[PDB]
Amino acid sequence: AHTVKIYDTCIGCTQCVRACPTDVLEMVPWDGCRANQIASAPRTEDCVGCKRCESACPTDFLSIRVYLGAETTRSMGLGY
Amino acid sequence: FSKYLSTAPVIGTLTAFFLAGLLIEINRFNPDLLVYP
Amino acid sequence: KIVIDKDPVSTSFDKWAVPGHFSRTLAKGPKTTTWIWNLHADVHDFDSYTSDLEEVSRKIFSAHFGHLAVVFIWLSGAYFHGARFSNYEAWLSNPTTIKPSAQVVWPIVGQEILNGDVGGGFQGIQITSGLFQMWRASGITTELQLYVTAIGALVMAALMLFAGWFHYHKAAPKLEWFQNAESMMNHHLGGLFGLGSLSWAGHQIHVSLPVNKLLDSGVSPQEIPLPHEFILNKDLIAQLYPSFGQGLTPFFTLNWNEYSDFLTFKGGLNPVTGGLWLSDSAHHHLAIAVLFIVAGHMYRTNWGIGHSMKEMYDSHKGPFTGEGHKGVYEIFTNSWHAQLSLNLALFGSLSIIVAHHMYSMPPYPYLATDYATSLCLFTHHVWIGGFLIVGAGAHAAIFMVRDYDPAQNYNNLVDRVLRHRDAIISHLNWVCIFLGFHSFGLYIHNDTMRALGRPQDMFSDAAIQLQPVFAQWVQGVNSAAAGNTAPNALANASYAFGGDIVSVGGKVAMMPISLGTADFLVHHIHAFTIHVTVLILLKGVLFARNSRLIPDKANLGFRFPCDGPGRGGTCQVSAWDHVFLGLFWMYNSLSVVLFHFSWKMQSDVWGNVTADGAVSHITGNNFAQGAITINGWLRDFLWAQASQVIQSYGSALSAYGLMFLGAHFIWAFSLMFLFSGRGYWQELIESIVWAHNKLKFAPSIQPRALSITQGRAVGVAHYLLGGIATTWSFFHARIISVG
Amino acid sequence: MVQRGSKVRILRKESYWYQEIGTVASIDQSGIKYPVIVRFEKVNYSNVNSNNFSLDEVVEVE
Amino acid sequence: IGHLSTPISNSSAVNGLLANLPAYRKGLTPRLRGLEIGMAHGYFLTGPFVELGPLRNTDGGILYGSLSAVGLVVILTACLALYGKANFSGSSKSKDATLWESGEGWSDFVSGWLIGGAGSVGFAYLLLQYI
Amino acid sequence: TLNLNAPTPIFGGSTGGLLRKAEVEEFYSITWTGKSETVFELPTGGAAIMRAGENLLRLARKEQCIALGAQLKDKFKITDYKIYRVYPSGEVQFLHPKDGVFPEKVNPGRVAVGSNKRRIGQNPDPAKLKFKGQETFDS
Amino acid sequence: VMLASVLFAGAVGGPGIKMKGQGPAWPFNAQIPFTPSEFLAVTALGHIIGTGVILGI
Amino acid sequence: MFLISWRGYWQELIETLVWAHERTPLANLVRWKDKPVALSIVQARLVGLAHFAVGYIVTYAAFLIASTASKF
Ligand code: CLA
């Protein structure tokens, strides 16, 4: 599966979650503040690798990264 | 219309129309200028 | 019902200041340099920024007036340059010997060597547009009639341009004036096409036929009376086809047989000129007019009688096809793109039909012997036609993204084609592979057989024969059709199927284009290359909304480059990218059609006739055994016939030699954009913004690389321009020298 | 300590506006990491003009 | 419903030809259905080789053409062996358990294609050079 | 749960959907309640009609379920879509909403999976992690 | 012949018209059927049929 | 062909050839073990450059030899 790592420069903008076409991402409360959020990827096996979550991140050089790893049938996006 | 002529495509064209016609008229009275004589 | 609005848009220059004023995305200012290309991309796409179909359609109507202006401006320049800068007066005295010419070149740096010895006492560029043969068929004998027509087009150009100002700024029609397709079809059929062919039929009778009757008797262009004298002096119209002495009494009393001398069905070629008989074309557009005027009284209007196109589609439904054509009228009175794509398909399909019907039935006098024009007239309208067919697959795809509605289309004929599109594409996929093997591989077989010294194993006429029997039969039913099944016609529909050699001057005007083993191969090359061009464009249309790969491809748009490197990589998935790929295949398909045409005629058809009657063609009948191998296509066509485009330096054909190499450049320059990608240059520019930011003068409009979609677009644009203009220069420099 | 309106230079080496001048729009008056909001004249490739930096990545060139 | 229902979809005039070919026919064993498949394809495959050959007007052409067609069948025995070596690894069972789904008879099918394929190539050599 | 059997929409078509991959492993099904009898585009071809329902549709990919689940939230405002993935010849039931709420909404009890306590410019060089099982982005 | 063709167009093509009763009315507001839209219809069709009939024979 | 045309045209072309193979009788029975996909993005840059570079070199070596062996 492709690896999705979320870095701490995220702001809880929730834009990469709603730009995901395969429902990989979600929002989660933050530990050290307990008010703001961060994105999280608990469903990285579903990730096709379209990098639409990077097109929606407003931070300068985006806080969520996608590294295209091994290609399963889900990440290849195959209907067969 | 004057503020239209200050825009880049027109003033990029009429000066290129000016600088070409500068070079065109030079080669009519001064033909075949290879070197400085 | 005419309904308009009075002054919706003022005539101001406030928006001439700001570029990009029309959209909410633009006019804020170019922060980067993509805005300069984002501006010129989405100007004449009125549907994106304006979200009112009433406001959109007013922009579209008045814009065709502006395009009608630039055609009239272009037509005046065709008439002015024939008036001032042409040898049209000297050409009418000797039409075979003197080459047609306009566009005198100015005495500057050396381009006054292009003003060559073109004929008589004139020096200019030998033109290949056929305006000299079109104006002779119109009857024009002096340059004053060309000069006033150039003025007549410029006042018409101002008339259309004023009408585009008026019908948007002052009196803009409402939406309901545009959705009346039945009254529009009634008016364009009888009025534009019927009266346009009725009134032109009036010109060919009163004007064209009298002067050509004396020109083919060959008196002089000076001794011939002016064409108003054939209207005033009825004794002058009585000495030639004396049926005008009875007036319009043969017309109204249905005694039409008295018009058997200027409304004929002779149907052949003129033995003096080598064009169609003008009395045929006089009878032609008269019959076309009545068919078009009668057909314009078909569709219903506010007078009750008439067909309704909405109720013809309702109850045109079978058991295979569900709800039938129910919904295609409501699609076509709301989508401006589905109207554009269909009107582009049959405008470009027609433009190749015009090319095929004009080399074989040459309509104009001394067009057939002018090999320099008949080849360029073919190759032009073929090339014009194929661009418009790609615009059909383009604008059909733009229909699918934003004008397609699933609620209006349930089980109709749009839904049922989008439901078995995997059966349509894959059966189209197979038939290209079947045709690519069994047509191109028969050349690869013939290369390998002639290379290995096995000439008895290839596909030829002295070998394993592949004779075209389904086309040779149709050559037989149309060459033996005058007198048996078209009994009134004196000769056949063309001499291309069968008939005599019409020899005007020393040269062949037309002769029967035979079909052999080579003609089986190229016509299946044409069948193959077209079916791939269909396959790319139709894949773009049917998968414009979704696929198994991207199920929301219509939410991303008609024109977006990729959905990323995931799903294996989704580059060129959109509907725009299939139009981009089909442009090369259209270029690939049509360039063989023009290579087929240019050597079929030079070897078998075009040539000279001796004083006994034997024909000696241009390339000497080498299409039969040469054009079955790719080496013969290289050795005997592309290498052997480019010997005039490269030996043209130092002569009057030199600008064809410079356009030859200069188009090899732009073609090869296009691969810099096609083969490479954007993100290289965006980090190369980052080294050049640095070397400008070092000296403190980097521009505030930040430099960007061209987009992925633009880099594809700027690469296909220079690709077609590089190869067509090479084919332009190769065709022109060849047939001017030998034909 | 940077205040609002102060013209800063960015030391974040990954940023598009690294070693470039920008004006701080605001600072967040809590303990949130990366509170410094700088507005820039030049847009990056995603055509935005702001980012959240820390005080360690900015200076006080004024 | 997921499959499209055209009027000629599920027609008994062509669903009866599919159910009676030796790939879907119920009564056959894999040795027999390899023989019936092999006898049909080897019979026509010698067709294009004797009339469209590198040598056709020879002594000479009917034998070497049919020598080429048995050359295809001995190639295609390997392809049916290699497809069975690959797609049936451990005789990989599935939901249907036919000759095509699980292996279960596959070594006999390739020999059946071998016997009937080399037969009808030689059988059609008799009807062309002789008879 | 999946509530199969549930009525398929009144569709009859689509070559482009649910081929041999579905019967061996991992097809999906999206279940919703549509508050009309209206037409909607499918990711396969375009129409069906949504039932009163309990509406269910068996799709090939999860990507095709979220694309259809976005259309029901956009055009019809029915956001009650509840996708699944099947049993013995499938893998994992109840894919979305995974914690009883939409992923763009915050929900306590979720754990930040794939989080990093560093920036991207603080990523190490790959030469420092050479010939080791560590990767240049994992923590 | 031509005057017979207007009756043949008025008897066959006459009841073929789907929309009846429209304007304009007759100029004296008379109680005459086949409103002059339809009279211009069947006479033009009668001039169409009567032309080919005359030239066909 | 591998340089100008890029991948996701062909991935959506194979997703119909996969369909036409799974629905064709007497060939529905023969099954792949590898699911057919298009060539990758990095892959057909190499494939397009290889055909480019071989075709660059094979064409000149045929021309450089035969244009000199014919005359010396
Ligand atoms: C002459 C007086 C005049 C004036 C002052 C205006 C003013 C306006 N027009 Mg109007 N209009 C006019 C005449 C005029 N128009 C004419 C003659 C037509 C028929 C073509 C129209 C049809 C029209 C439409 C459909 C629209 C406007 C619109 C507008 C508004 C914005 C246009 C703009 O800013 O771009 C200025 C544009 C240009 C300077 C480009 C003109 C391009 C010309 C027509 C053709 C150039 C092609 C040429 C052949 C080049 C070929 C290539 C070359 C290398 C050889 C502005 C109020 C727009 C509007 O109101 O939006 C709400 C709008 O949609 N006009």
Ligand code: CLA
């Ligand atoms: C000359 C270069 C070239 C060649 C050979 C091809 C070939 C093909 N293109 Mg491509 N294409 C090209 C340029 C080329 N294209 C370019 C420049 C672009 C960018 C615009 C494209 C973009 C493109 C698109 C968008 C599409 C194609 C498609 C196709 C395929 C059409 C199907 C067919 O008829 O195959 C027939 C095969 C041939 C004609 C090759 C001749 C080889 C002979 C006959 C057999 C080989 C001899 C021997 C048996 C070799 C094996 C022995 C060896 C292993 C030892 C075909 C493979 C289409 C497709 O795939 O749909 C099915 C399609 O949609 N191409």
Ligand SMILES: CC1=C(C/C=C(\C)CCC[C@H](C)CCC[C@H](C)CCCC(C)C)C(=O)c2ccccc2C1=O
């Ligand atoms: C060369 C190239 C570029 C670089 C090309 C760029 C940036 C275009 C810039 C060139 C033009 C000519 C700059 C024009 C600048 C001014 C308009 C010049 C004005 C001069 C006046 C006198 C008229 C890409 O961005 C690119 C992107 C994607 C695929 C392929 C390519 C590609 O091949």
Ligand SMILES: CC1=C(C/C=C(\C)CCC[C@H](C)CCC[C@H](C)CCCC(C)C)C(=O)c2ccccc2C1=O
């Ligand atoms: C045609 C094409 C395909 C489709 C190609 C496929 C599916 C591969 C088909 C090739 C067949 C298998 C023939 C190849 C046989 C070779 C002659 C030998 C290959 C074996 C070597 C290991 C020796 C792409 O996937 C693609 C992707 C990105 C950019 C361009 C393209 C592209 O142009």
